[PDB]
Amino acid sequence: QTRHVVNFHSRSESTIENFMGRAACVFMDQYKINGEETSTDRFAVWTINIREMAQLRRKCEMFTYMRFDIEMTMVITSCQMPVLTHQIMYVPPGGPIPAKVDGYEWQTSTNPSVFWTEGNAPPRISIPFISVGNAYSSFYDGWSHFTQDGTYGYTTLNAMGKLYIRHVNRSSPHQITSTIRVYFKPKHIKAWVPRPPRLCPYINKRDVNFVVTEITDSRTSITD
């Protein structure tokens, strides 16, 4: 490459909606169709949070507070029959969860769910700003239980819900193993209180713990 005259004047790509509002795959999971009537491998879960993969997690930690609608579009495949129909049930933060693929929670009228049959365009489900407070908090320097009990750093304001996914087909002659890819996207996003970027690598998906990392890459002397 060579250093060219990069002559233009634009910061439309540096706004918050043009920086955060990009769809990224945040959840791959397998789920079968038949066998093991009491099993946990016939549906998917994915509690919705921004701390899924470190590339997106890093961008949400530029800012302390942010509020945004989310608009996820699943991309569902299958392996190994009839034409298959799926169900992507979003439960709110206050919502019952299934324990099995044939639980009664799947029939709850307050849990919105899409019934996508195979071959069409991917299913898209949009979720508004659910939180109780006025913004989602990326960081919470505080304790969930009063009087400095356990569970540091986890507030219940930035709870977004869960996403239970199953086949609606009751059975099949052979085994069908479906794969789902959830494409998370912030929408109509506002952000408050900027914050310095992450320096150290991430350890765990529910905490801010880190190993002490060097500031920059080292060089030989101060003058070279």
Partner: protein, 238 residues
């Protein structure tokens, strides 16, 4: 030289960094009604002076509960379970003319700090010791406590670019005093004052203290907090 006074507390001062360009203010409903103390609460709460030697790596205080034993403000924390305030923070250094050094006085809202040996948590008495400050460390440490190594202050960020927050430099060559006004940054209008630490006043010496063999071996840093526009929940019926 301006001799400010608030209530029954007078300090002697010598430019204000208004945090995020906003001055603290009150929240303005009969379903939930706030109580505005105004009386007391607003006076100056001078913390214990902190000696800054050549080998001091830094300090941090976690507010609002750093004032949990400070008078009426520390007593209204026990009777009301919701509140908010503004916290004008003066930081003098009163060094001499032959001392040299530089401080970063930054407030860092929502400083979620990391444990020293990850895969576990810390016993909640490692973040704060009410009035007294937890110092940083010069290198890495282990044990069930806060990873208090500078260059990764508490949060896993670079300590040099901690200037994004409401800050003020105290260069002993030029100035000695800092003052920061932090207008209650939070995602809910009122929150409990014992669970949630709204911000973390941390003072970090970038250029280390230096002097010769005749001066005093330290420089006392004086911290003074005035809780402004503190309002609480209502205790009366409607």
């Amino acid at each position: 030289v301006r001799s400010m006074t608030l209530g029954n507390s007078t300090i002697t001062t010598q430019n204000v960094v208004v945090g995020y360009g906003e001055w603290p203010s009150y929240l303005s409903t009969a379903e939930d009604q706030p109580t505005q103390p105004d009386v007391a609460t607003c006076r100056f709460y001078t913390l214990e002076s902190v000696q800054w030697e050549k080998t001091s790596p830094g300090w941090w205080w976690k507010f609002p509960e750093a004032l949990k034993n400070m008078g009426l403000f520390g007593q209204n924390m026990h009777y009301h379970y919701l509140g908010r305030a503004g916290y004008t923070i003066h930081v003098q250094c009163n060094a001499s003319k032959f001392h040299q050094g530089c401080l970063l006085v930054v407030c860092v809202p929502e400083a979620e700090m990391g444990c020293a040996d990850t895969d576990t948590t810390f016993p909640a008495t490692e973040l704060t010791t009410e009035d007294t400050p937890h110092v940083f460390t010069s290198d890495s440490i282990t044990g069930k406590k806060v990873q208090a190594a500078v260059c990764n202050a508490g949060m896993g960020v670079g300590v040099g670019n901690l200037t994004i927050f409401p800050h003020q430099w105290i260069n002993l060559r030029t100035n000695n005093s800092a003052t920061i006004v932090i207008p209650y940054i939070n995602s809910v209008p009122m929150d409990n004052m014992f669970r949630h630490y709204n911000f973390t006043l941390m003072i970090i010496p970038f250029a280390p203290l230096n002097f010769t063999d005749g001066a005093t071996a330290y420089v006392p840093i004086t911290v003074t907090i005035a809780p402004m526009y503190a309002e609480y929940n209502g205790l009366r019926l409607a």
